[PDB]
Amino acid sequence: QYIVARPVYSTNAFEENHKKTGRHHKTFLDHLKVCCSCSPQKAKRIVLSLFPIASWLPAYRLKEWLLSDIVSGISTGIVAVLQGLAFALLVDIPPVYGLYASFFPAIIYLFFGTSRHISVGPFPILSMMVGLAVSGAVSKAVPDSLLDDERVRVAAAASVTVLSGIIQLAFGILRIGFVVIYLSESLISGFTTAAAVHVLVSQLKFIFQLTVPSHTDPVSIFKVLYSVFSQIEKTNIADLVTALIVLLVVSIVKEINQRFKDKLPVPIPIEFIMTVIAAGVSYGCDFKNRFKVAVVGDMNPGFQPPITPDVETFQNTVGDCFGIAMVAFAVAFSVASVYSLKYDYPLDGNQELIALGLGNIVCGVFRGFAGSTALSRSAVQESTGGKTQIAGLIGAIIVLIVVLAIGFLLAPLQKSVLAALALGNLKGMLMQFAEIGRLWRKDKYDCLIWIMTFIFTIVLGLGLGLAASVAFQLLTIVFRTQFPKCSTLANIGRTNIYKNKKDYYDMYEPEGVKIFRCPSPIYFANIGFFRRKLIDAVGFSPLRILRKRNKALRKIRKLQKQGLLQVTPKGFICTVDTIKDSDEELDNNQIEVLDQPINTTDLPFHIDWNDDLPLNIEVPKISLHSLILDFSAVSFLDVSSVRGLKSILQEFIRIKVDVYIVGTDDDFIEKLNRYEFFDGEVKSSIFFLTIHDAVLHILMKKD
Amino acid sequence: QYIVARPVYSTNAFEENHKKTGRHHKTFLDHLKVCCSCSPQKAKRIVLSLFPIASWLPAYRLKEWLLSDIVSGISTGIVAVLQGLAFALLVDIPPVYGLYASFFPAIIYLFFGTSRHISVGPFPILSMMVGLAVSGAVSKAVPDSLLDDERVRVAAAASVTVLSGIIQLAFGILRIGFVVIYLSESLISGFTTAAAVHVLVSQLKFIFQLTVPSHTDPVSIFKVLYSVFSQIEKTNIADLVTALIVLLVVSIVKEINQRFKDKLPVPIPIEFIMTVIAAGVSYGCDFKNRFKVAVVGDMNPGFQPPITPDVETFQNTVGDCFGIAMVAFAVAFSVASVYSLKYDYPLDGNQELIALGLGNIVCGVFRGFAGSTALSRSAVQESTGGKTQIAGLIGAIIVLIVVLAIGFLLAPLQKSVLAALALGNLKGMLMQFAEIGRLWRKDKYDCLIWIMTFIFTIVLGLGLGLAASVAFQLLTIVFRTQFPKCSTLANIGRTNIYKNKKDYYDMYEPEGVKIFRCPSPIYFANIGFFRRKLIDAVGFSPLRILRKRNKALRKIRKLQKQGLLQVTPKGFICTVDTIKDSDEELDNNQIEVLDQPINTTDLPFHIDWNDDLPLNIEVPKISLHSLILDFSAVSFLDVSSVRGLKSILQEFIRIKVDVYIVGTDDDFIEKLNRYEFFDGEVKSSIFFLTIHDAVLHILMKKD
Numbered sequence A, B: 001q002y003i004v005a006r007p008v009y010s011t012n013a014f015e016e017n018h019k020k021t022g023r024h025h026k027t028f029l030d031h032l033k034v035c036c037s038c039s040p041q042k043a044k045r046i047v048l049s050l051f052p053i054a055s056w057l058p059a060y061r062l063k064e065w066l067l068s069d070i071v072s073g074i075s076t077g078i079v080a081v082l083q084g085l086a087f088a089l090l091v092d093i094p095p096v097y098g099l100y101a102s103f104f105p106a107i108i109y110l111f112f113g114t115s116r117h118i119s120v121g122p123f124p125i126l127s128m129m130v131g132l133a134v135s136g137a138v139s140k141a142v143p144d145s146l147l148d149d150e151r152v153r154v155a156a157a158a159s160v161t162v163l164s165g166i167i168q169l170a171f172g173i174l175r176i177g178f179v180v181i182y183l184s185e186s187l188i189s190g191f192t193t194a195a196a197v198h199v200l201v202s203q204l205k206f207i208f209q210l211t212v213p214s215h216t217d218p219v220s221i222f223k224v225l226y227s228v229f230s231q232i233e234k235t236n237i238a239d240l241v242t243a244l245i246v247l248l249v250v251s252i253v254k255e256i257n258q259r260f261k262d263k264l265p266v267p268i269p270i271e272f273i274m275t276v277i278a279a280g281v282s283y284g285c286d287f288k289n290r291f292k293v294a295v296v297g298d299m300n301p302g303f304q305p306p307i308t309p310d311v312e313t314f315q316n317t318v319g320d321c322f323g324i325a326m327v328a329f330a331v332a333f334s335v336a337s338v339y340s341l342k343y344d345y346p347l348d349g350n351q352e353l354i355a356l357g358l359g360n361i362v363c364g365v366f367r368g369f370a371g372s373t374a375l376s377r378s379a380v381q382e383s384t385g386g387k388t389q390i391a392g393l394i395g396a397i398i399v400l401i402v403v404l405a406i407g408f409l410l411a412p413l414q415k416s417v418l419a420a421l422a423l424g425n426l427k428g429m430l431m432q433f434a435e436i437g438r439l440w441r442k443d444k445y446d447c448l449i450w451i452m453t454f455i456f457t458i459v460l461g462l463g464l465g466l467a468a469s470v471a472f473q474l475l476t477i478v479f480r481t482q483f484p485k486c487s488t489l490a491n492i493g494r495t496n497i498y499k500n501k502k503d504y505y506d507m508y509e510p511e512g513v514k515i516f517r518c519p520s521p522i523y524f525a526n527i528g529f530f531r532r533k534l535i536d537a538v539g540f541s542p543l544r545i546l547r548k549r550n551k552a553l554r555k556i557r558k559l560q561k562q563g564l565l566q567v568t569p570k571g572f573i574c575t576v577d578t579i580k581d582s583d584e585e586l587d588n589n590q591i592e593v594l595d596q597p598i599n600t601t602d603l604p605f606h607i608d609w610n611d612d613l614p615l616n617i618e619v620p621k622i623s624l625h626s627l628i629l630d631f632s633a634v635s636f637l638d639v640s641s642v643r644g645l646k647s648i649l650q651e652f653i654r655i656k657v658d659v660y661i662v663g664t665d666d667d668f669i670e671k672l673n674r675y676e677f678f679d680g681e682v683k684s685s686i687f688f689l690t691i692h693d694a695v696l697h698i699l700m701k702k703d
């Protein structure tokens, strides 16, 4: 049973009887002495965190991990080759520059990366963003043969990814890799669903084999849909039927694959099989002069010399590279967190930013495009038994073998087989459309974030819809705390339990006491609503009672100068039966003296303000004498709240109503001490521990 | 004294013994039957709120208010004439179009407005915004004598203000006039200080008499400063010395004016006096051919016929007109709220939006620019004794007399006297620079809002810095709740008071109980920090203990198949002294079975997990058996919080640690019922009333 016998405490009387420890909290100048104090332990702890390969490579279990890493590396390197060739088409550069995007960041991440299970390379949302930034950068260059219009796109892609890597590396150095908390899962879900719709639309010009101009920012998906479906009569039917056959086979076998996972080890590489079959039947049957199928061209065997990034492209694409860097880091951290939770090893977000930025810089210098991880390729690497990032090294070696030696193969590949392979794996992102119903019946504030993120991304493009979506998801936090359900409380069962007055049957309120509760932090978007709810909860406005009391006092003092009210020790004598109702109106520059506190020390008689005032002065009466504010769910105040609350409490104190703030911790009062809140009128003795403390104090101080 | 004797309640046992009232809360379809249910009382209540002049005009006290309204109307009409002429220069149109800006909204607001003390007209921040929007609109028009370049600016100004009035009227119709709560007072203070710096810079080309091109959006103030100070050798010294003399005299007399306010009724109109003296000495001495002073030209006597707004200017200036409408409504509501609080009458914000939008539409049709109220002119109207909006009618009649009849006067006015009069009244907005110190020592989150609003407005212009400032002040709410000071609580004095464990001396914790407190709402930017703080507060991670227990159970079950552990009713028999430490590593696709709940029903012996496990199996021990979460300051959860909290509680329950959530109201649990939160593992019986309830329940259920 609950049995408590203690004294009534008042948050000052609690601190006289219970000695505090007196903690000396930390300043700024010693925050700048814990950072600059270097040590031989601190330096080695830093340089083993900058080069994580110095810590996991000598701890390699080369009896339990090597064969699994080799098998997983081969199985992810084949997928990396095909995905690089397919994602180079979304940037509209020659396809061999896709392979450079799947080699250099995977080599840099082996040395500088902290995850063990992600596969580093291109992924289609980032490749679409890089393609849109290139189309925006070549449409803004100053002026000074379709081999030279793609030589500009390659240099623009290289410059965009060098700038994105520079931004990522700078944010990793500045230790602000915690920015991934500013994206909710509803925002990520809506953004990835709309990006899957963007990817699905962008692969239509390769299936139908049409020529679509490179549209730009505001509504890119509808311009591309119009330019595709206005030329639908020029559709090459061989590419269409080949893409449909490859798409049907890869979706059927990818359903069969995960439908039967207990019986099937190292799952079926149906995309490699269909690519081999399609390139082998396009060769031999000569699907380039019988029909007019566009193929992957003759890729040159070898790497290309490094280029210097153009500062004009740096100037024209600053916000595009900011969006590319943010989306790349957010996707990589979201994918790597799954496997770090699954296998229990720590992830360093700032080291992730440093490794991805260095990989993107080295990739863009040697003419590749932007890299992060993909969820699909990382799932392929982890599903086949990847243990460390040596599987990434074997995958990069497979990409290297394809670049240097076997590049005469993949030349009869039909360029719509790649689009069909990219369309066959949009299923996981398109199945997120069944989340509007769940979030609708769950929250309705995150369903709004989902729907507005989808709409903003669709009708504003992948770079600008993300910024608008982040701003709207910041608005929804204000929407949650805008009109809080403010309550009046009452006692149940004649004990220390106080709940909502409209919720149970036999509640009891002490006479003259009001207990008000705001279940929300009070800030600038909240304080006027709080004042309105408090005023209609107590039943009156204290400013009106104060002003009418001041008007009555001015009329009483005016009648005292005329000798009409001879003041006794008790009671006014009233040596007139009735005066003829002369009300006096004050001017402006003089009305604010009605808001001053009443000091009736010149009369020996104590004016009651509640019984009856002589000579027909109405002065409306109140029954309230004590007000309790339950500030237990109020997490913070800012400035506007402290001003408005100081005004409310000053207006309540001046009409002789005691106020009590109840339910706060010591940090709340310690922050209120900085706000110039307490003075000779609002004292610190209004704070109490619990509601029952204040109620017992009221009942003791009355009688 | 505090004496309580009650049973221990558990938020389900409280609702079996206290019958709820069962309120039927309101749906959507009856929200759409309270709006469409029309009545003869509802219709008259609506149409008396659309035309407020039908309610205050027959209640006019024409014995106490008429002379004061006449005097205040004359005193504000003279100021309205001079301010209209001065603010027409910030738009760079001829000055007579300033007077039309101070006539038509003041006439429309007399019929449709709810305030009684504001003066409607131009104010310099809005006139600078209209000038910037005109300069941006004439720099974007398609192509098809300095009399024709200002005929384009007049039509662009008219179109911009018609679109701003349309936006204001549409937002007043849609009942969303509560948007003024989205601007903190720190944002308004920083914005108005930077706008005062903009106004001070924009009046330099009229004092020095220079020719400055109409610069635009990104850094307008530095381009204007460069274009002024590169031509400083061409300064007309007569305009300079006249502006300095007028500025010195008006600042000295405006200090003298409010230094002595008790002795001085109806304060000194020093601006009217200096304008009369300057125009009378510029005439007669002929300050137009002796020197080369630019003067206010010959204004044509009369109004101008209405024009149709160009839809090209509507197309080019959508965001500019949105910013103009928002700033006009915010300034007007902030000024009108002061006098509504001072004189105790209700303000309707949506009717304010409707009246201002109609006034701006009618003003822009008849070739004026945008209108709202100014704080200075409203202070002049209220200080001289304005009672109703009939003072606005007398002011508009004074402006009408100046337009129709006396326009041959104000023709020798020196056009830098007006700039000096506008510079002499920037003191109130420039004295807000002494708020970085106050907000620095008070909050440091609103000082940041002030500084970033000032910087964004200065280096981005008045339209775009406001949007960036609103986005940053939405970011600061996330900054406040990002890393909450999470605590571990303990008991003081062997009663029902639980406070921070590091704060007092003789605290007591029950053995095996941890009380954790997060003093913040938990949302998407908050849940990973909450999980990290809970894990390092309890001293371990429950996933690691669960996985190591599952590994130990798999090794025990493997040794049972070999007959090495013959299970008794109690104790393992262990018919081997020591096996040679064969640890087994699981594959991927098989590791997640370490996260499954332990069901050791196949053994009759109860496995302890805390004493000793045979054959040297370590399985790290915990002393915790009960965890209490103090969710009293947690105002809301969203989706990510419910998922992360469900994960945390499921991981704690599976290692046989009872969890208790404590301190919530019934609305919190009612919202958690929608989230698919409770199941066969996480039940609703974990919720308790207070911390002492849960602690007494723990101590009763142990022994």
Ligand SMILES: CC(C)CCC[C@@H](C)[C@H]1CC[C@H]2[C@@H]3CC=C4C[C@@H](OC(=O)CCC(=O)O)CC[C@]4(C)[C@H]3CC[C@]12C
Binding pocket: A218, A219, A223, A455, A459
């Ligand atoms: C929920 C709210 C925030 C949605 C707001 C949507 C607007 C941002 C969209 C809807 C209509 C769009 C417009 C629809 C059509 C066009 C014509 C289009 O014309 C072209 O130049 C086509 C391509 C070419 O030929 O170059 C340019 C974009 C534009 C102005 C669009 C700009 C973006 C707009 C205004």
Ligand SMILES: CC(C)CCC[C@@H](C)[C@H]1CC[C@H]2[C@@H]3CC=C4C[C@@H](OC(=O)CCC(=O)O)CC[C@]4(C)[C@H]3CC[C@]12C
Binding pocket: A219, A222, A223, A226, A227, A455, A458, A459
């Ligand atoms: C998520 C959806 C429901 C939000 C609302 C969608 C609208 C903003 C979309 C739907 C139809 C779209 C239009 C569909 C087709 C076109 C034609 C397109 O034309 C061209 O690109 C070139 C035309 C030419 O050759 O002149 C320009 C965009 C536009 C107007 C689109 C503008 C954006 C619109 C109005």
Ligand SMILES: CC(C)CCC[C@@H](C)[C@H]1CC[C@H]2[C@@H]3CC=C4C[C@@H](OC(=O)CCC(=O)O)CC[C@]4(C)[C@H]3CC[C@]12C
Binding pocket: A166, A167, A170, A171, A311, A312, A314, A315, A318
């Ligand atoms: C904390 C992180 C986000 C810092 C990242 C900083 C970069 C975004 C900045 C720093 C240096 C900047 C560069 C400094 C100088 C120039 C040269 C400038 O060009 C010229 O002055 C002449 C050449 C021309 O534009 O024709 C174009 C912008 C650019 C590349 C700037 C682009 C933006 C850069 C890379």
Ligand SMILES: CC(C)CCC[C@@H](C)[C@H]1CC[C@H]2[C@@H]3CC=C4C[C@@H](OC(=O)CCC(=O)O)CC[C@]4(C)[C@H]3CC[C@]12C
Binding pocket: A314, A315, A318
């Ligand atoms: C959010 C925090 C990390 C600060 C980020 C700052 C950047 C957004 C700023 C800092 C340096 C700026 C650059 C400084 C100099 C230039 C050169 C400037 O060049 C010109 O004006 C060339 C002539 C012309 O464009 O007509 C164009 C803007 C730019 C790229 C600026 C773009 C915006 C930058 C990258």
Ligand SMILES: CC(C)CCC[C@@H](C)[C@H]1CC[C@H]2[C@@H]3CC=C4C[C@@H](OC(=O)CCC(=O)O)CC[C@]4(C)[C@H]3CC[C@]12C
Binding pocket: B218, B219, B223, B455, B459
């Ligand atoms: C705290 C952070 C967010 C501040 C970010 C500041 C930037 C938004 C500013 C700083 C430097 C500015 C630039 C400084 C100089 C110029 C050259 C200026 O050149 C002109 O065209 C001058 C006028 C003309 O001759 O037409 C155009 C604006 C620009 C690019 C400015 C664009 C806006 C910039 C990038």
Ligand SMILES: CC(C)CCC[C@@H](C)[C@H]1CC[C@H]2[C@@H]3CC=C4C[C@@H](OC(=O)CCC(=O)O)CC[C@]4(C)[C@H]3CC[C@]12C
Binding pocket: B219, B222, B223, B226, B227, B455, B458, B459
């Ligand atoms: C609140 C402050 C401390 C924030 C940082 C200020 C900078 C963003 C400012 C300070 C100096 C400014 C510059 C001062 C002078 C000029 C020259 C000005 O030149 C012209 O307008 C035309 C030049 C020509 O004739 O070619 C263009 C803007 C610019 C570069 C300004 C760009 C913005 C700058 C770098």
Ligand SMILES: CC(C)CCC[C@@H](C)[C@H]1CC[C@H]2[C@@H]3CC=C4C[C@@H](OC(=O)CCC(=O)O)CC[C@]4(C)[C@H]3CC[C@]12C
Binding pocket: B166, B167, B170, B171, B311, B312, B314, B315, B318
């Ligand atoms: C809830 C509130 C914010 C609604 C406010 C809506 C306005 C901002 C919209 C509604 C109608 C729109 C107009 C509808 C049609 C046109 C014609 C359009 O021009 C043309 O189609 C041809 C002429 C040309 O531009 O050359 C230019 C934009 C404009 C004026 C639009 C400007 C923006 C307007 C006024």
Ligand SMILES: CC(C)CCC[C@@H](C)[C@H]1CC[C@H]2[C@@H]3CC=C4C[C@@H](OC(=O)CCC(=O)O)CC[C@]4(C)[C@H]3CC[C@]12C
Binding pocket: B314, B315, B318
């Ligand atoms: C925030 C809530 C209240 C919604 C606000 C919606 C507006 C921001 C949208 C709705 C209608 C839109 C307009 C619809 C049509 C047009 C015509 C369109 O004309 C052209 O594209 C002409 C050709 C060219 O510019 O090259 C330009 C955008 C504009 C003004 C749009 C601008 C953005 C507007 C005003």
Ligand SMILES: N#C/C(=C\c1cn(-c2ccccc2)c2ccccc12)C(=O)O
Binding pocket: A079, A082, A083, A086, A124, A269, A270, A271, A374, A376, A377, A378, A380, A418, A421, A422, A423, A424, A425, A426
């Ligand atoms: N990963 C993996 C596999 C196949 C592919 C997945 N996408 C993809 C498509 C859209 C979004 C994200 C990923 C491919 C793209 C081209 C060629 C092959 C694939 C596998 O072998 O299972």
Ligand SMILES: N#C/C(=C\c1cn(-c2ccccc2)c2ccccc12)C(=O)O
Binding pocket: B079, B082, B083, B086, B124, B269, B270, B271, B374, B376, B377, B378, B380, B418, B421, B422, B423, B424, B425, B426
């Ligand atoms: N109001 C009032 C008075 C004088 C003026 C105040 N500004 C002003 C200037 C900047 C910002 C806001 C206001 C004027 C402008 C032109 C001509 C006269 C005035 C008064 O007569 O006291």
